[model samples]
Target chain A: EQTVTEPVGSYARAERPQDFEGFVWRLDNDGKEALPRNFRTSADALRAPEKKFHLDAAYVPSREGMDALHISGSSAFTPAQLKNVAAKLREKTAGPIYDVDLRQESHGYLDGIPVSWYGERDWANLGKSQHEALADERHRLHAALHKTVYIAPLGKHKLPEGGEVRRVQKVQTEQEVAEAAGMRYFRIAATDHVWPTPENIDRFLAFYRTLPQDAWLHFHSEAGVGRTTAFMVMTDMLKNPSVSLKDILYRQHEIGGFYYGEFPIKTKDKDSWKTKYYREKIVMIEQFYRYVQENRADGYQTPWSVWLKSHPAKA
Target chain B: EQTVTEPVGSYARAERPQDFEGFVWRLDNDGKEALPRNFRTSADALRAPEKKFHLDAAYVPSREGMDALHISGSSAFTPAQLKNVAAKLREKTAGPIYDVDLRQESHGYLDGIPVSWYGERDWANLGKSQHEALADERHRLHAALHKTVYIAPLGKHKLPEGGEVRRVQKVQTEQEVAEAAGMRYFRIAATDHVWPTPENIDRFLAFYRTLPQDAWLHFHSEAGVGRTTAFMVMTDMLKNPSVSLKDILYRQHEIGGFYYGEFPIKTKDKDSWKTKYYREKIVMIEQFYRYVQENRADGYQTPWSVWLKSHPAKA
Candidate 1:
């Protein structure tokens, strides 16, 4: 008997060669069907239902005592799931996370906002006006000339989760909502399906250097595919200079795949918009790897801007 | 018996494949020795010494009855030679030349300036400041934000060649001197040793469309190697869309060779700045050809800007 792979973008049908199928995160134990479970915190994610946090999360460990990188989709957390994610992240990273929300979109649901601070009742009962109010504040935040905004909630929750969420009803160009439980929140603007600017990457690396050694980076865009995979390799290159493009790409694909759309094949849909978007994402990633590789310093940790100032071609 | 190929950039020594060595303009005959003489208004240019205007020039026929394109180095003329140029240009074009001097650099000699109008006497005897004054006027002309300047001299020579040239003795943001004998003058900004901008190319196409069909294009930059070759190909592409890249490039190179410096080979001097500038010129020309090819329409003649406005990818 066969079960249908309901999702249109099942990695099971992804056109990557078969021998290289190093890892898969689905329920179908016989390896026959596409499992659309959002979380892959375990090998058989559908069987381990409690582990499905619905965020498409993956963890790749870095330094022994201090380093780690956790990637996921635009995070949505209930007060209960907030603590659950924190305990799970602790298994990978040491301190509260340094979350970099690399998204440029201005409006989304309250469930995506963390009501609790990094240190405890967060999340919704959000009203329509409250969502509008929050979106407006975020719109203003993302539109700022310097194009960056950070929200590090001041203290532990001082009110009930529902009452605290109501603070959004009075949204001005301000923020004091609790940080996501395991990470301080900062939004760095990035366009979907396009590579972020070289200057933006430079700024991220500069900001990355200022973090406390114990904090792990928790990165996400809406899908945790293009932007997530790009930044993942960006930091990894800084950590390991000699890595090959496909070597690193294949490993990242094993944990969390990219281009969540159809790969071209010998079919009429080969040139479809969905298919072409996937093709461009693949090309842009290759360029991203090239850009980062050429831009690093002798230590493999320098930002391009910093490296460039010292080496003008004319000089 | 041997002249020792005196000029390093002589066509005699330019290492081109024999089959493709289509045309040459030189002083020595019997197919030997580098010819450093610049003008090439005809075949066997050396025998016609009086026709040697000392500007690297070529005449490619177009639009059987009306159109023509004349390519050359930055032009310089003696009062006597001004009439000579006028008479020679008349044999090709029915009206005055539409000279597009696409050089961005500011300082140069009065010899490069057109002392007389598109009608008749212009040449020079110079003081340092006179040359400096003309350069300053051109500097302002070139640096204008819109970055285009036109000089349509209102009246023909009102005085002797030397006296009329003294108009530069009174410098201001003004123009009323006679235009060059066979052309009205205008400068379009373009960088040396680099491809001009797509916008600039678009603007040129727009400007080119406005010209009278009888007026020939007399295009020049300083050396006629990099910037000169580029614009020559650019216009030719607009006129003849079906032309191949190397076919046009080889023809232009035949008349006026590019990369006056060494091409990389077994020489130790390879990678010298002079040599590499030549190498980049070659690559940039290829890119220029590709850019023009994709940006054309069904008739194979459309400015990219015009085509783009009607076809935004999202639309």
Candidate 2:
């Protein structure tokens, strides 16, 4: 029977006992025969594929709407001076230095520089301060070195282990444990560039070798291509220092895998192609090191390896 | 009692399960620790410290004496040409030209250049025939472009893995893999008068990270230090990848662990004073990709994490 199953590496694989069989089967399905394709569409949709998804600039994240932060507040400047400083600050730092009320706060002169505009510390206009008894040296140091660049520290994330959220929950537990143990869990986001050298391509092939048996791929097709173009290796298996799998499991575990993640992806013909996809077998097959469950909870499917065996590989 | 144990890493902690309890009992007897200390002392006396190991020479396999390689036989130079060429070759290459037997051979020519000497295609005189070939009009492509100078099929071997045997292994493997994959491994040994520098160090470091973890560091210390400080991280963990445990096992799988196994003993103390050697962890941990190992056969110690964890607090 020409059965439809997800492409290899579409979903993450499991490391436990029972689900392993199913995971391996999925690998063979995609690795052995799957080809890239797109979703199917009616004849009427043929004219302008470019406009298929109507995305406008309206959804863009503009920098203007962002709020402003002030370096030094009021009391240091008059209303006129503060207003002028705000204008100048906007021009120099690209908009938005607001809500700075430093009325009673006391800090020495900023490098003995006379405040004219009343904004950030303009080091260019200042002389060394001896008596200024300057502010907290740490913040000043950070400011001087241009250090405290605010970047959202989003904790690391992992992909869903299987097609359902429940499987992802189980893996999340170990993902947390691994993280606590100093192991980083990355989703291998497709947006990142990957190198396409021949040596790098070999590593991708090696990552699959690390999974247990009976894993499956979560293949996603392009428009009019059906479900076969892109997918992930998926399964829910326990991972730890033991049980080195048959392959490199994770694609990055292979030679070219890391470089592959560095490959440059170009958008063309209005088609969005993501390079990085997740797979479970790739994670479980690693011989050494333990990736334990810190917290596992999602929708659908049991965490136990025995139950997952009954489920067939799905696209 | 500084409790001397086999440098067997955390295997002991894992096995004993009970932290200091079992350790105390083992210490009571003192036999296990005593034997190793005595044994190591004897071993240490016989061993050359890392700093003393002069790597300018090569170490053939202890077991495999030599292989009967059908190496480049002479292009049968006459008695007069052989002497002149050998002297000239020695002067130009600044290295020895081994096995120059031409009695059973005859002078051969490619295009018009005589294929004289065969020791890794030295660039000295370009051989009589090769020089002649450059002067020939028919072989203008090879003549004009290559300028009658020839290098190795797979470039020159600077500091190869484990001396001669390992370096030869790399060359052979590179050739085999390149041929199997229908590609070529081009050698980039340059002949410019520029000496090694910080810039060269940076380029080599960049190249080393792209290679598998198996690539060994083959470098010479400043002036007096003679050791295999030159190393490369090959990004993989194949068995018997290195001759010494120090290179193979360091901090973590990706980061490597505690540095040991250096030649020329007593040059520099790694564990006691050196704390965390820089190069071993710089690319492996500081600015490393996710696709690398994070464990080792050494004391199961992850110095990189320890260092990182301690670093922020210290800072």
Candidate 3:
């Protein structure tokens, strides 16, 4: 049977079969050795074969990473049957390094991963070497964070160990950090969602204003997780007028993307059903407790303020 | 060793020893409690007892909450200690019930808990009360989330719960929740702090632009928790061309306020200090989490555009 890890982190996958002639005497129509095939149309009808499936057929609905079998209607990718096939696909893909972006920024699809623009050309023909590389690239992004990623169309940029370049910066500022990965090819980084109301922009800005004005580090929750509902719910509380009321003002973004349909905005639409970063921010905030334990820093605790000094009024 | 519980969620104070004389223990010595004796000083000497002590004696310089008390050379008040005194003060005086107006339409000092003008004169001692409340009234306002209070002398419009009446509201917003309690006493409310600048007023109005135009429940975080730096930082961020670099744009505000100060609008009279909430807005954003949660039950979720169909564009 297929097995996978919980959301807490560790992941495992079960075995599955392949799709080939004489696989099971062609009888019982089901065995642990058949390859999955979601293709129902004739080969001539495959449009943009580079894309695995259209938007409607884009993802395979599965909770854990282990369920990676390609399924079709009436013909399912059963646990034991799917496991074996997945292993083969796994062998095709190699890794010590994986894309952190796919893990961090994915929002729209089932794997919760997004394939890069160039990688789009290799989406189909899962058995092909190109497809394996594409999947590997997607996963790599998922695992990466805080690193510079080069997003040039096809040009190379030198990136350090922990950077991903989503878009190339023509001129880097002390404030600018490389956002994406790779040098030769640059990628455009866009979050999955944006709460487009000016009120939300100001509300978001207002919340950001509460942070200390000195520390170099900054964090933001991702709107890519679910939908605009998340951002909306979060914004509502921030406007409340209670000092004793503790708000999730400081948070490390764990979820990614911006889903727009949930709440249509005037600008570019976000990509997810709801923004799930509120939960992630809370979880990250809790991480501080563990951080305190690890460092053994004196008097380091939660609910601390770190505002910078006020500057003189400008003439 | 007399114990006293502080009403309206504050530091506890010990009972004055019968043997002790008048006004000897001042907040100046410990910097924990504000001195009540500042009233004896003439306006020309150092007017506005609370503000005078704020500038003169100085409360413990906490970075955020009372956690920094130890480092700031200030005393800490335990919850039990505060609760004990609150009980005792209830018997001695109903001073906490009414708010005393100081600057007419700007600000007023809270008497304590349930201080309201509706009560009988015998219930209060106006002669001895000026800025701070006595006891009994403090107990009542301290218990709930939103209690209203009103006073005439001050034309103040909006006061937070646990604070004094500044102004009355034609329509009460959440701002008055924590400050005035939920009494709904209609007389006049005022602001205790300096006047809102034209820029601040403009910025405040601009902040509304960030939300859904048709939302009934709108909220904004202060750039900083208690200072002017928050305002300054927010303006800078808002005006910046690239918002993605402002990592907290989607979430954590700590990064902005700590480095920028709570206020963003700065005056160079001496050292630069924010006159507005530019930097503080981030803190307000960070701290707004609880505010959102507390209001969920009152049919107040973040408004979805779908929900705004009924709200007119001008709204």
Candidate 4:
């Protein structure tokens, strides 16, 4: 006899304690296959985490209007560890997750489920003259600014005490390690410090504009300060231009404080690099608003790559 | 017998237009002294010239909050010409007039009444570490930005045709000329292009913050573009944060249109220098808002110079 597992929104809770595991799920009805689509119980990520994650992870409503979870810090986890965390997250949450790390280029899988990877830098280069979609792949992608590449190398590690030493394939590059791990990666074009060029800005708008309206989503970046905060703030501003930057900074700090036992936003020393960093970030967002206002009539539908082809930078 | 002329705001407008003898002005109450404050009656600004003068002059309300006049373009006018215009203005319109030039250092009189001169650059340098008050003089005054001294030079200009070549004392420096030929000058500190440093920002706020609430004011710069627009926009923003920059630009263009016979606001060209100029100016205003929001706890009352003294720029 064949058994069917229910989807995230409609799965039924299992009565048996052994079968009912984790916060958002029961055991898979078809207890044999460990496919990502097969799940037992419905999701329970209704409230946002009372705070934001120091590692830059945070739970919030996705573009689809359902609970979404974002976790970044590609440097912190190994492939096996990444899979385990995703596996654990699957047990406790539902909705689509997005990995917004443009600088880190690597990929991996979770519990036999394939993950995608892409870098915004490569994508931007590819679309130098015009935006072009990448070939759809089952898993692994690369994309965004600052040029570098890696393929994780091999190494060894000790097994559990008394156990034989394991011949672990040590990853040589952080990108290679991330490639062997991490969540699905999306492609877009942008750079740090410099304001987003028109094409990149369009890419950003186009992606969010087309996101699943009813699904929860997540976003993350390396270190979770500069690019991460910019993405978050831009998202807010796109929805509501009047949203105060001060309010967003304070709110993020509040959430961070709740999660990390201390406030994350710092502006006390006006001359400090961190303070300057925050100010520059705010300036970038303001520039975006001005760009959109000034260019709205040009129509924002063109993908950045395509736009770039027509509006090449001055030599 | 000595006659006392009431100070500007309280002075009653002359019932007859004849007292306004020139296009600029010289009060009937006290004509011997070239002091900045001795003038009485009103000011009249005549002629919408076929072309804009290089020095950029405009008529508008004074900072005192009542009907006032302003005119600056000293570089384009001779001392006799300035006196003639002032005499004609005094014959027609009513209210005190101001000169808003800092670079064209030359001066003249309106029917024997004197004008003032001072440069923003010099004032800014003098107030390098703090906002300070300047000494008063009859015709010339020291107020903002840079610092310098003035001593009128001895020279002569040939009278038109075979008429006597008048032995007029020529000023040695434009600064000296301005001292002898312009309207009342006030000092504050700031430079162009570079965003106003915190101290300069403070000076701006302090000067305007203390102005009489009920008065109208006039502002101008070299071409009446960057610094002029900045001051105007800052004034508007300080009064109403919600004031739409879009609206202000259009309105300014509208006023400029009325004065210059064409609209001046242009953002349509995405790559044009003018568009870039407008965008950068807007960015400065945005910066001011961010600065204020981020540093509100420090209190707006702290002068920018003092703020700078402690937070010196990095080498």
Candidate 5:
């Protein structure tokens, strides 16, 4: 094992052997160590020779900041190596800071206090040096709210400080926390696997009708794709009640770019087979459109909460 | 008696001795004759040569088209004379045609049929010659629906075809006629003399909240001034809930130009005095603001109609 220490507030990285060699590690808040991850094909890695200690080939996806410093798996890099490559990436891009990460169960600090969390693992524990380097190279995000409606699943993550939490039943949603984190958040108790209840739909329409003109909104689930796309389609319907389903599908494809297609569907490459998630999304969208057509002109006042209660998913 | 015959649909002018020398005359649809009037100074008139006729002087106020040829009071003009003046005005200003007139009880045509009316009185009877000239020179008007609530007093004017009529009580509001005229109309039963009831306000908010994003709306009253301005201010409040009253007043003044200030007031150059209509408009706006601020974030569901019934205007 290789151990490295850096000054406070500086980004630091260490290297060690995992089940195989050439693994990078970072210190967690509890001073526990975890592998450096998801940076194999990043600018830093590409600039250096490929490591031949274990895996024959490396494949790392580019991300905004933190994840950009790792290799494909839970990879690792020396402290000096991580710092040098990050500095080069920072200088090459020369832009505002932005961050992205894989959705995973994780815990991190909110103003330096521990908080329970889910979705997008913590990157702050990448040591003071690596953290500061990524922070210095973050990207600024833009947002708008005109005529835009965002919908998302209920979350139970709690942030440190007396952060605002959207309490829905026994679980709390992270809407206010997201809002506090520079995003406008609207939430409902719609679950990921189950169809949205009518109560959630009612709350959605009410909030949507009052939205200002000339704005854009974002919706998200754990991966910020599936549930996000569903709400996005719903928003499109609200704005364009007369739009065709094909057009909405095409719009979703365009927004998601190649990633929407890249996600694997569980089946043989047979024409008859379909992904459950994809089918679920399409069915939900169709039902939503049907509901809107039947009840839209009268302000969409279908007792959706009650309607959902009657239309339970199959076991 | 003097008579002048002109070509097909030509503006004809005949000076005939009447209650005074130099009096001009034209026949109504039933061949009833009327006197020539309105030799007053339009802003354009003061800049041009004074027309010398059999009358001591012509007092026609220059308008964009047909009204450009008439005098003050119930003026009459031969179709030929009116058409010639309209042609000249059209050439002098090469732009889209817009017509305005005093709100008065009068008769006109809706697509060639004789229809008695009020408000922006009888432009068609400016004479067939002047009418055709204007008809050939009319501008296409463009306009929407989503919470965009339109508010207007009831209209009973008949449209050209068998158009839809929104009849409230025995009175017909020309909403469908407006729609048939390539415009959408929203109507409420608020009269000019009385204050709008809370019920109307409720209807207004409900409709306004469902307006589509990309659309323009028009609102009007008889003179297209006081009540129109009041609604305009109220609509302004609806769109910009946080706007100040002073800013709203300035916006109205900018849009109405001199007409808003020209309306008669009861004050003797004192700040304390206000026109009854003006005072009512201000009071109504204030009450509406109060109601909205109290109920808006919760969807503005005040029982306005019942409230209006309870708070009748002082006798």
Candidate 6:
């Protein structure tokens, strides 16, 4: 037999972190809508509490006045609500507006028309206000793709000139509709309440990389908290890989707090199992953080996609 | 454009970590054989210089003193060398020996006979000793899956009575061969030099959850560095989720250092792109670490698989 030695006897028992809930905690920021400092609310004069816009949103500014905005699903917001935010977003950044919607679910597509209130059944509380808002938002979102949203001018309001139904128009279509809508929309796949797939993220990042530096990126998922925060941290990390992963996470949570006017991390029972945004979300953010940090070891002259492209050939 | 206000001008540019190389680094360990402390090396009598065993291995003692051992690909070692290490492993723990070989590739299956040296050609330095050793190791490994090595007795010593060929007998087959080899062999799928697929790991963990507390788990892949270190850290985290992920990773690296005699991470270019173990590997490790940490938020009384099974039904 060969001589064998044990590892140090004082290897120590595994200990939990002092801030166990520091990384993973409920991110249910208050639905009370707010904006970044001095952010232009172009159509703010039309807003009040009762007609309260249910869209929870956040903003993180980047280099050279570039900005990133994220909001919950647009389908639940009224036409006016969506327009108010979209116009402000368009005005906030002078560059091309990229409103990338990361959701892996199908919208309500019944009989060839994508209607927000009917098929997807995602209208806000089935209320008349939300019903119209959803119809409006759906119309705009549908234009992002080559699809059209049809609404019969159902109840109280008249359609916006060519509002819902475009009626089998030879869609210029996807790109032109997006440009006309004041922002380019994207549909990236992601899991709700969890992480977006890495390949989806890689492709998304690739698209972002191709965009002009001054362009604005608006990312959104269901509540705009999970996938939104996950991606915002990815952006934050890429912008600042020197920053620690947890530090990036902490700052994203703070930004989420500012946009929603309340920090979910401060909610009761931060460490409870009931809190959402668990390990899956944090682990993904961490993975992206490391990727940005080390990928820079080759130096930052080349872009991330450029590096990934020529670095290793896949099997 | 609408009037827009900027974010705080005081927002700081990213600052690099005090320890930039705190995470990703090369892990080429010195070619030295080491055993855990107080461990019985049942076949140390045949090891020395000149006939250097190229297997780099590590050990992590887990719950109930149930040990976990890992080694690089065994194909390059002499039959005696393989037997020597196998015997020590068998005697080290008093439980089911799970020698899980995680490699997704054809191990030179020519004409239905699995081999180590001839077709796959992984013999060490093309030396006679290694060639014979590789032949011997191949014979044993092929026995793991109802395959046999067809090497000619083209060198020094004669072969074990029925070593190279069992002549396609009524083979009691896969399970019987594995049981007869003094250990249960498994061929779990995994990517070399990077992270294994998450689903593969979920399945692997499910299997691990079913294991007895006193089981001996021996995991391996080429060089026993990337996948080896990654999985060992996973085990270390599961055994102790209370510990920080980086802390678990740091400890696993230290254990790897002890096994290989020298740490490749301490080489001159620690932060250089030349390092082998890159972001892909670390990200995977970090993910598994976080999973173990938060899965216990509900409580640890229930097993991981049991919780995963009834908790969330995947889409």
Model 6 chain B: ten consecutive residues of lowest lDDT: B19-28
Deviating ranges (above 4 Å) for candidate 3: A1-315, B1-96, B99-315
Each prediction's RMSD to truth: 28.0, 31.1, 31.8, 30.3, 30.8, 30.3
lDDT of 3 by residue, A142-234 (tens): 343332222211111111111111221232211111122110111112222221222223333344344332211111222123222234223
Model 2 chain A: worst 10 consecutive residues (lDDT sum) = A20-29
Off by over 4 Å in 2: A1-54, A57-315, B1-87, B90-315
Interface RMSD of 4: 46.4
lDDT tens readout by residue for model 1, B167-254 = 1223222122215354576565554444454455666777777777555665655444566656766666656667665445544454
Quote the true-contact fraction of every model.
0.00, 0.00, 0.00, 0.00, 0.00, 0.00
lDDT of 4 by residue, A1-315 (tens): 465352111111111212211110001111123322211111232224343334333533232311221332222233454455456554544645444443322323222222223221112122232232222221123221111111111111100011111112321332343344444445443333233445545656777777664322333332334444455545544544444444433333333211212234554453343443334344445555444444456655555445444443221
Task: Using TM-score, give the best candidate's number.
Answer: 1
RMSD of 1: 28.0
Error of 3 at A282 (Å): 29
Question: Which should have the higher TM-score, number 1 or number 5?
Answer: 1
Q: Count the backbone clashes (under 3 Å) in each candidate.
A: 6, 116, 230, 94, 55, 7
DockQ of 2: 0.01
What is candidate 1's lDDT per residue for A1-315, written digit by digit as tens?
364442121222333221221110011111122321132221211221112222222533323211233433323233334345455666765665655666543322232333211111111111113344346436543443231111222221211111111112222121222153545666555544444544557667777667775566656654466666567666655555566664455444445534222234222443242444355445545654655677655434656555444432210
Instruction: Encode model 2's per-residue lDDT on A1-315: one tens digit a residue.
Output: 695343333232111212111000000011111221221111111122122223221332121211221121112221233234344334434322232111111111122111111111111112212222123222332242211111111111210111100001011121232233232222111111111111112222233344333222121211111111111211112222122222212211121111111123344443332322312222222211121122123321232222223333222
Q: What is the DockQ of candidate 5?
A: 0.00
Q: What is the C-alpha lDDT of each candidate?
A: 0.40, 0.21, 0.23, 0.33, 0.33, 0.39
Error of 1 at B71 (Å): 5.0
Judge candidate 6 at residue A258 and give its lDDT: 17
How high a TM-score does candidate 6 get? 0.28
TM-score of 1: 0.30
